[PDB]
Design a protein around this ligand. Sequence first.
Ligand SMILES: *[C@@H]1O[C@H](CO)[C@@H](O[C@@H]2O[C@H](CO)[C@@H](O[C@@H]3O[C@H](CO)[C@@H](O)[C@H](O)[C@@H]3O)[C@H](O)[C@H]2NC(C)=O)[C@H](O)[C@H]1NC(C)=O
Ligand SMILES: *[C@@H]1O[C@H](CO)[C@@H](O[C@@H]2O[C@H](CO)[C@@H](O[C@@H]3O[C@H](CO)[C@@H](O)[C@H](O)[C@@H]3O)[C@H](O)[C@H]2NC(C)=O)[C@H](O)[C@H]1NC(C)=O
Lengths: 438, 49, 156
Amino acid sequence: YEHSTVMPNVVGFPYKAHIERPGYSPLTLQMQVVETSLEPTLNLEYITCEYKTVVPSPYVKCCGASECSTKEKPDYQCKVYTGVYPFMWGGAYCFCDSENTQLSEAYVDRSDVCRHDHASAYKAHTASLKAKVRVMYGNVNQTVDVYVNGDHAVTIGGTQFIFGPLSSAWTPFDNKIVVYKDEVFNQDFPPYGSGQPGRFGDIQSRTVESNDLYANTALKLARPSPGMVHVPYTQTPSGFKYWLKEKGTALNTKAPFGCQIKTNPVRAMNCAVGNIPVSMNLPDSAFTRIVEAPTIIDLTCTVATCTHSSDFGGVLTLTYKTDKNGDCSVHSHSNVATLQEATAKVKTAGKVTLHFSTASASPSFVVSLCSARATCSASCEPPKDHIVPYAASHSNVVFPDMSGTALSWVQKISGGLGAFAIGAILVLVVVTCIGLRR
Amino acid sequence: QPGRFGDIQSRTVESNDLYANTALKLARPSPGMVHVPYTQTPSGFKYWL
Amino acid sequence: VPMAREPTVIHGKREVTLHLHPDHPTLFSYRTLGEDPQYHEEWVTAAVERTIPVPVDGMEYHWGNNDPVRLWSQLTTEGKPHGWPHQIVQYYYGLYPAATVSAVVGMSLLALISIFASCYMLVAARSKCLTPYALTPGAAVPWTLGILCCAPRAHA
Ligand SMILES: *[C@@H]1O[C@H](CO)[C@@H](O[C@@H]2O[C@H](CO)[C@@H](O[C@@H]3O[C@H](CO)[C@@H](O)[C@H](O)[C@@H]3O)[C@H](O)[C@H]2NC(C)=O)[C@H](O)[C@H]1NC(C)=O
Ligand SMILES: *[C@@H]1O[C@H](CO)[C@@H](O[C@@H]2O[C@H](CO)[C@@H](O[C@@H]3O[C@H](CO)[C@@H](O)[C@H](O)[C@@H]3O)[C@H](O)[C@H]2NC(C)=O)[C@H](O)[C@H]1NC(C)=O
């Protein structure tokens, strides 16, 4: 028996589905989203880490001149300085007074621990959603793992469930993502090959194991001081360290809809938005023949107390007449009030009580016990406590019933004014028709 | 109230009775240790000072 | 690493007053877990006191090394529902204090327009039904004189 429904994408919401087969007794399923996981799709762009400037020892040519040679190294710098007269601890070598030349060489290289402490630049698109839903009904419990898209059917006790695609298409990750350890940042990194000194991605490596490197840190060399051998140089500080110091905020503590960001793999878990359509296919053995189920007649609904609070703050009573005792499948046919249970023991006494949760001043919903029906209306008082540590258990609908107190007052006032207006119109029409009849 | 002036009070200096409300809560000791942990809101007299 | 003490919470109307007692600089951060969050994070050093908003959507705050704690507000107000008309307005003004005023104003102007139109219709009808008899020195038909309050009560 094919059936379909739509359930909210809220973790912990006690969604209950009512299935009515005309030839059998009604059935009530309880589905609950224990956990979700929004996995995006990534394409690694490059890897950034601190750099390490290596300066080989200078070559001083005594009584001669040296020529610089170019090399294919990331951000290579080389110069030759004429007229140096170096010194050492014991005495000044390069015995020539002024015919000497020093060659200075330096270049940038990837750091030592770049494979342990590095930031990755990604591109995120077309996120895929996952869930973990607990389904219980009849006498069968059990939690299953599903993909939330209409391409995965899981069997729970002989019943096939398909969870349709999410209603919305909202993902907290922007187009470009930077991931560092256990933090995700919505950043706009420069493209490969066009980094800038002193900021994020001054040196860019296509992969942690890639040999190629692109470094741009404005390395420069300066003439050595007289009577020294030190190879002076100047260089703009690392961009990775200064990114660490002033990266600013994150996505873990900034994501909307109250959903945590994680890493390895990147995913936004337990993130409440949209609706999850559901498709089912139940076998003939799940239902019970109408002969076995008890009969319920003369169903009357009365509300003892009501309070539109987050917890189940309402109490409901049902009176009936029955031939034999057994079980029934209670349900509320409007989302104004969310019941607590999906089964109730009916007995020859003729009284049973149910608890519901509502968020409106005056609710109006129809409740069914097995095959019976009954309409309930009530007046509800606000709660006294200001803040609670648990989420709401109602669907958050606040418009009161048309038979409520406020709407009854509006109806009475509008009816009086309309009666006055109709009287005025009738008097004017009578006067005009009397004038015309002559 | 804990953390503010007069979190502990006594009728007089030599009075035997004492009222204390400092939110003293015990915690489970770590495995393989004997240290009886706890947590407590700091003194209200010092923060008043 | 150490875990800092839990703060003291005081509940308000969609607000939490939060007493913070650190020993060494700890990080305090919170966010409102709705559609548009309210972001904030700070390095609390000395004993301070914070007020943080808690809408109906809820919010979470992260104090030091402790696990984040979530708090949800509740649909509470100050008016009296199912009472006199001036109390239902208070009840629905404590909740959503931006649409109740607009709805009340709209209904009031609609009522005023309707009553003014009805009064205008009555006045126009009386003018139509009284002027033909006001062009001749004739009797006012005491039967009709009593029914409709015309200008001459008894003078002709
Ligand atoms: C031992 O020390 C002497 C210096 O007292 C060194 O002699 C120097 O040798 C270099 C090249 O070997 C000379 O440089 C060039 O020499 C040419 C010669 O025509 C000249 O035209 C250039 O302008 C330039 O000066 C340098 O002049 C010369 N100095 C002298 C002779 O006073 C000698 O090389 C040292 N021994 C060794 C093994 O290097
Ligand atoms: C369907 O299966 C689930 C999971 O087996 C059932 O939920 C489980 O209910 C039991 C009974 O309360 C929980 O055990 C108790 O949990 C409390 C929680 O504080 C703990 O203090 C007790 O010491 C005891 O362990 C159990 O935790 C809970 N499982 C989960 C994952 O929440 C559920 O009741 C079953 N459905 C029906 C209709 O029985």
